[PDB]
Amino acid sequence: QQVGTQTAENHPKLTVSQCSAGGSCTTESRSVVLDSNWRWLHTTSGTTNCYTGNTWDASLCPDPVTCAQNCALDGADYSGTYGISTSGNALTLKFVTNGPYSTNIGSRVYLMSADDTNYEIFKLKNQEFAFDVDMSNLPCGLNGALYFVEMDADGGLSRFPNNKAGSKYGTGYCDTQCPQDIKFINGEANILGWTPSSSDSNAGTGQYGSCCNEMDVWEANINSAAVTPHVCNVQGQTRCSGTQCGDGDERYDGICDKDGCDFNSFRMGNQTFLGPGKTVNTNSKFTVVTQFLTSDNTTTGTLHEIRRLYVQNGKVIANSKTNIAGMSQFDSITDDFCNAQKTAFGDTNSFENLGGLNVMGQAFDKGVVLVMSVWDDHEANMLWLDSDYPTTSSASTPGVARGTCATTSGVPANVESQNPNSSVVFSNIKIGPIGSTYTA
Numbered sequence: 001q002q003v004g005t006q007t008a009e010n011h012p013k014l015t016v017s018q019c020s021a022g023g024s025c026t027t028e029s030r031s032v033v034l035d036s037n038w039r040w041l042h043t044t045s046g047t048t049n050c051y052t053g054n055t056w057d058a059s060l061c062p063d064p065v066t067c068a069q070n071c072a073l074d075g076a077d078y079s080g081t082y083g084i085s086t087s088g089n090a091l092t093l094k095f096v097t098n099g100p101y102s103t104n105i106g107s108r109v110y111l112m113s114a115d116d117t118n119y120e121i122f123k124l125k126n127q128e129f130a131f132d133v134d135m136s137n138l139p140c141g142l143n144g145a146l147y148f149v150e151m152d153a154d155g156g157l158s159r160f161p162n163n164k165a166g167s168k169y170g171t172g173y174c175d176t177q178c179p180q181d182i183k184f185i186n187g188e189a190n191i192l193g194w195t196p197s198s199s200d201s202n203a204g205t206g207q208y209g210s211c212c213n214e215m216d217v218w219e220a221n222i223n224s225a226a227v228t229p230h231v232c233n234v235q236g237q238t239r240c241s242g243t244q245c246g247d248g249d250e251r252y253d254g255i256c257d258k259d260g261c262d263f264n265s266f267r268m269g270n271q272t273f274l275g276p277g278k279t280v281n282t283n284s285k286f287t288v289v290t291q292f293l294t295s296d297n298t299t300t301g302t303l304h305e306i307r308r309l310y311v312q313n314g315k316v317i318a319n320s321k322t323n324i325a326g327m328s329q330f331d332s333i334t335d336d337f338c339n340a341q342k343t344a345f346g347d348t349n350s351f352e353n354l355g356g357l358n359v360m361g362q363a364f365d366k367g368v369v370l371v372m373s374v375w376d377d378h379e380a381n382m383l384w385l386d387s388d389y390p391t392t393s394s395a396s397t398p399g400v401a402r403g404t405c406a407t408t409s410g411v412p413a414n415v416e417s418q419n420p421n422s423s424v425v426f427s428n429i430k431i432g433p434i435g436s437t438y439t440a
């Protein structure tokens with residue numbers, strides 16, 4: 001994709017922190033960028049859209065390469081068009097942003113580095129990541145996500161000749177769902193066999209998907225939360241097609257683990273731990289601390305454990321323990337835990353099959369990009385996060401019940417109509433050595 005020059009691109013500023021052993025943190029000038037899929041896409045000018053709604057202009061895009069060559073991503077009106085705003089160290093992502101001719105649903109942004117051109121690269125092994133979240137405005141069917149993906153620092157600028165836009169315009173997204181809704185993958189328009197969605201006027205899918213390792217630190221709404229590593233048998237952002245994308249029917253055939261090895265306190269058998277008025281009280285702001293422990297506690301150790309702590313109202317809250325029949329007590333993610341839970345829940349252990357935490361830590365060594373988003377789920381209505389899933393399964397079968405939301409909740413059309421003013425606020429982002437990001 002080329003660079004559109006109709007509208008200046010200015011990344012909303014966001015202050016984050018870097019912490020040292022002992023607890024001293026310093027502030028850092030960073031910013032956020034909107035994912036390229038949301039952007040206006042058009043010719044150099046004479047200005048005609050290359051894409052609108054869920055269809056392409058076939059004259060400008062007769063093939064993937066010509067399309068990338070002809071088509072330019074433009075600047076974004078962050079607050080007024082996309083409902084994205086920042087104040088100090090806080091990012092607000094609004095769910096539905098109405099306009100005269102269209103409605104914007106959700107958003108996805110990436111944290112920019114100090115240079116405001118390339119994405120910030122995080123090296124998470126032997127490190128701790130903290131942030132504060134307010135989910136009071138995220139009901140059933142919504143997801144305020146903070147996570148990491150193995151994107152290129154330049155979003156594909158240097159790798160792909162016909163990507164001339166790069167990270168400044170939020171290109172190069174990938175994750176373990178290997179999304180095929182992505183418009184540009186590998187500097188080529190994803191138009192081969194393009195199918196406009198019959199149930200979503202904003203989305204289509206092409207032949208290709210964009211896959212990479214993903215650490216889901218936080219997928220949550222007021223009701224429930226999950227922390228979930230996912231791995232792939234490929235290194236970095238990789239284009240897939242056919243069975244490798246593991247689309248729908250061939251979910252467990254592809255190159256990435258779509259389910260991931262998840263820790264949802266409610267799913268792991270503690271229904272009183274997290275939610276409105278619970279131990280971690282989702283009616284108010286709280287801190288989420290995530291520690292990435294290695295085998296020998298060095299930066300070259302194998303990633304061996306992912307621990308979680310919360311901090312609310314000045315109190316440090318230890319993660320809940322698993323409470324599943326036949327299953328041992330774990331309060332953290334280890335390869336051992338992953339084997340145990342996939343077995344206990346009768347799930348395909350793709351996480352371990354594709355190399356488990358070792359492979360995840362190797363992604364961390366290469367480097368990962370920080371993603372923040374708000375979204376609804378056109379695939380499974382967010383039921384996997386906050387309800388009973390599969391809906392056809394017994395609600396008392398271990399692993400089925402993930403939250404208190406109704407199996408009829410989270411239909412996109414319904415939540416967009418009924419809960420348009422939903423929002424998530426992520427704030428006070430911190431990175432440093434284990435034990436440095438929070439006060440005991």
Ligand SMILES: *[C@@H]1O[C@H](CO)[C@@H](O[C@@H]2O[C@H](CO)[C@@H](O)[C@H](O)[C@H]2NC(C)=O)[C@H](O)[C@H]1NC(C)=O
Binds near residue numbers: 269271273319321
């Ligand atoms: C769900 O998690 C909470 C929080 O850890 C548990 O409540 C604690 O129970 C332990 C006993 O192991 C005691 O130390 C405390 O009284 C509780 N702590 C707090 C902060 O309330 C609760 O037991 C868990 N529920 C289940 C079913 O395992």
Ligand SMILES: [Mg+2]
Binds near residue numbers: 157164
């Ligand atoms: Mg290029």
